[PDB]
Design an enzyme around this catalytic site. Structure first.
Site, mmCIF file in Angstrom:
data_model
loop_
_atom_site.group_PDB
_atom_site.id
_atom_site.type_symbol
_atom_site.label_atom_id
_atom_site.label_comp_id
_atom_site.label_asym_id
_atom_site.label_seq_id
_atom_site.Cartn_x
_atom_site.Cartn_y
_atom_site.Cartn_z
ATOM 1 N N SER A 14 -26.281 1.905 -8.651
ATOM 2 C CA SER A 14 -26.272 1.968 -7.175
ATOM 3 C C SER A 14 -26.856 3.352 -6.847
ATOM 4 O O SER A 14 -27.879 3.733 -7.414
ATOM 5 C CB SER A 14 -24.802 1.745 -6.626
ATOM 6 O OG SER A 14 -24.713 1.345 -5.186
ATOM 7 N N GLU A 34 -26.643 -9.358 -6.174
ATOM 8 C CA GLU A 34 -26.630 -8.024 -5.597
ATOM 9 C C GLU A 34 -26.028 -7.942 -4.202
ATOM 10 O O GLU A 34 -25.301 -6.996 -3.888
ATOM 11 C CB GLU A 34 -28.043 -7.455 -5.577
ATOM 12 C CG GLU A 34 -28.552 -7.101 -6.946
ATOM 13 C CD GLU A 34 -27.795 -5.947 -7.562
ATOM 14 O OE1 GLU A 34 -27.100 -5.209 -6.819
ATOM 15 O OE2 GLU A 34 -27.903 -5.773 -8.791
ATOM 16 N N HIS A 50 -22.535 -6.776 -7.189
ATOM 17 C CA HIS A 50 -23.084 -5.459 -7.401
ATOM 18 C C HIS A 50 -21.993 -4.555 -7.934
ATOM 19 O O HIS A 50 -20.987 -4.330 -7.266
ATOM 20 C CB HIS A 50 -23.595 -4.976 -6.051
ATOM 21 C CG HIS A 50 -24.113 -3.575 -6.035
ATOM 22 N ND1 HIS A 50 -25.358 -3.235 -6.520
ATOM 23 C CD2 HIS A 50 -23.590 -2.441 -5.508
ATOM 24 C CE1 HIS A 50 -25.562 -1.943 -6.330
ATOM 25 N NE2 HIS A 50 -24.506 -1.439 -5.715
#
Ligand SMILES: *[P@@](=O)(OCc1ccccc1O)Oc1ccccc1C
Ligand SMILES: *[C@@H]1O[C@H](CO)[C@@H](O)[C@H](O)[C@H]1NC(C)=O
Ligand SMILES: [Cl-]
Ligand SMILES: [Cl-]
Ligand SMILES: [Cl-]
EC number: 3.1.1.7
Length: 540
Positions: free
Chosen positions: A200, A331, A444
């Site tokens: 991230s 995601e 994610h």
């Protein structure tokens, strides 16, 4: 005194702790200071090298988590709380950690450096999911992770001033990299082979260190998991940063009377503010109703980043460089419960078409009406435009594609095109222990616990399949770290994981089944996102 737990770095001596990993003992030296505490008048300012100490520093416990916003969406719920701070908050927070095998390794060991994520707002190197003990025990690695400053403390910028120059969190990370270059040999690490891996925002940070020369000089290989230095969320123009900081100050009564023009006297006022004032006010400066966007991120100052990332990745020369990039299968999903109405962890989150359109406006915040129209058009199944399930999954896809997937596409394409050796993956395994609902797929962030090898801890209730899978990923990552290739040298039976190339566009699926090679990483959709969309919402 344990010879393996006493180290003498440049600052002085420090004492570690012998930990029990599943398969044996490891050495942990936790909470090593790498900078002078950026408190008081050092607020918003680049880190200063830690002034040498005397006596043996106690390095057996994790240090403070950097002052930061705390997540309250689903309180009590593991799925959010796992990312929350697990030690006390403090602006005195620039410490780092090293795991090594026990005894400390005889020969120079390829070093892994971990940069955490969390919006450039949340974060700590001490979370259970970023625990180096397994990689150390099992793959023999030397693993380093630092804290860096998040939030306003790390990223409030009045671009060009001395007192708040911007990107100081990145400078924290860099200082940690220098510490590693200068001291990791003492622990058995090998300064000649350093891999950065992140996720991230973390990955974005890794991206930035690739792109900014003085960082680039300090390591050799990168791994970017579900994040890039390019893309919509990871940076801000100096204009916007200046706007945002100014506004934040206004919000905490810091013009003070009505000013903001003299930067020095502004940042000065800000430094007279309690840290929770700044936190409790940081999100308020966001310009539009959005998700996957935080107030304070790396800025494009023409210093750390000499130009926009997109420019740099376009026009760089990366022959010298090996990168491993990848995304998880879903995601977008995690972010929907944080703003897009109709989405919850508590049910199937089936949505009306209306909620879908409004959701696109929220998810692609900076879209023009026409851009949004193109998005909706591309993402609708025009045969069943009303179907809630298709819609839900589509909204997940829009957010994922826009923020993570197609930037990873773009970045892999360019880096490959520009000399680098790239390897690409898609992580497709839903952890048996996942607490997030079924509709969110493989969200994610939920590959980390596998890369770090948490399923090797039998108390953690993964399946045996998952233990094996964890070991497989660990082998992949450490092989890369060691040699710019994730493949098993002493083998041919995997089958081989081929390099991503503009020609062939090959990536692999990482799941429970053996490697499978796929071509085209959301090729068409990403052509939409990366080639057309910019021609559209600009020249509008
Ligand atoms: P990333 O940093 O995602 C969070 C994020 C990113 C950009 C803007 C806003 C925002 O909240 O990190 C994670 C996301 C979800 C779960 C865990 C992590 C580390
Ligand atoms: C900014 O303005 C104030 C007067 O309001 C002045 O005292 C100060 O010296 C100025 N700062 C700089 C660096 O010029
Ligand atoms: Cl000073
Ligand atoms: Cl419609
Ligand atoms: Cl799904």
């Amino acid at each position: 005194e344990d010879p393996q737990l006493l180290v003498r770095v440049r600052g002085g001596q420090l004492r570690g702790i012998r930990l029990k990993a599943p398969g044996g003992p490891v050495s942990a030296f936790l909470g090593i200071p790498f900078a002078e505490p950026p408190v008081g008048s050092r607020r918003f300012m680049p880190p200063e090298p830690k002034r040498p100490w005397s006596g043996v520093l106690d390095a057996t416990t994790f240090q403070n988590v950097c002052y930061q916003y705390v997540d309250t969406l689903y309180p009590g719920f593991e799925g959010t709380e796992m990312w929350n701070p697990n030690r006390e908050l403090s602006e005195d927070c620039l410490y780092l950690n090293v795991w090594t095998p026990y005894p400390r390794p005889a020969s120079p060991t390829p070093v892994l450096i971990w940069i955490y994520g969390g919006g450039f707002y949340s974060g700590a190197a001490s979370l259970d999911v970023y625990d180096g003990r397994f990689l150390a025990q099992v793959e023999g690695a030397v693993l380093v992770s630092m804290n860096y400053r998040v939030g306003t403390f790390g990223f409030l910028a009045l671009p060009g001033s001395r007192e708040a120059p911007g990107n100081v969190g990145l400078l924290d990370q860099r200082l940690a990299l220098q510490w590693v270059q200068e001291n990791i040999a003492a622990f058995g690490g090998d300064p000649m082979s350093v891999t950065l891996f992140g996720e991230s925002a973390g990955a974005a940070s890794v991206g930035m260190h690739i792109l900014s020369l003085p960082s680039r000089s300090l390591f050799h290989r990168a791994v970017l998991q579900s994040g890039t230095p390019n893309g919509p969320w990871a940076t801000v123009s100096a204009g916007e940063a200046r706007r945002r900081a100014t506004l934040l100050a206004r919000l905490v009564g810091c013009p003070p009377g009505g000013a903001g023009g003299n930067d020095t006297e502004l940042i000065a006022c800000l430094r007279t503010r309690p840290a929770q004032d700044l936190v409790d006010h940081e999100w308020h400066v966001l310009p539009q109703e959005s998700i996957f966007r935080f107030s304070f991120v790396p800025v494009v100052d023409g210093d750390f980043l000499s130009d926009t990332p997109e420019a740099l990745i376009n026009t760089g020369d990366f022959q010298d460089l090996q990168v491993l990039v990848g995304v998880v299968k879903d995601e977008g999903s995690y972010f929907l419960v944080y703003g897009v109405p109709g989405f919850s962890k508590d049910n199937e989150s089936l949505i009306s078409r209306a909620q879908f359109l409004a959701g696109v406006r929220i998810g692609v915040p900076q879209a023009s009406d026409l851009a949004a129209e193109a998005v909706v058009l591309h993402y609708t199944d025009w045969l069943h435009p009303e179907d809630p399930t298709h819609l839900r999954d589509a909204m997940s896809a829009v957010v994922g594609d826009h923020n993570v997937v197609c930037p990873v596409a773009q970045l892999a394409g360019r880096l490959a095109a520009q000399g680098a050796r790239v390897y690409a993956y898609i992580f497709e395994h839903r952890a048996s222990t996942l607490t997030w609902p079924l509709w969110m797929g493989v969200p994610h962030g939920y590959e980390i616990e596998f890369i770090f090898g948490l399923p090797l801890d039998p108390s953690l209730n993964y399946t045996t399949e998952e233990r094996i899978f964890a070991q497989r990923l660990m082998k992949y990552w450490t092989n890369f770290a060691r040699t710019g290739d994730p493949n098993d040298p002493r083998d041919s039976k995997s089958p081989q994981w081929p390099p991503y190339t503009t020609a062939a566009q090959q990536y692999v699926s990482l799941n429970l089944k053996p490697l499978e090679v796929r071509r085209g990483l959301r090729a068409q959709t990403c052509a939409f996102w990366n080639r057309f969309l910019p021609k559209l919402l600009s020249a509008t």
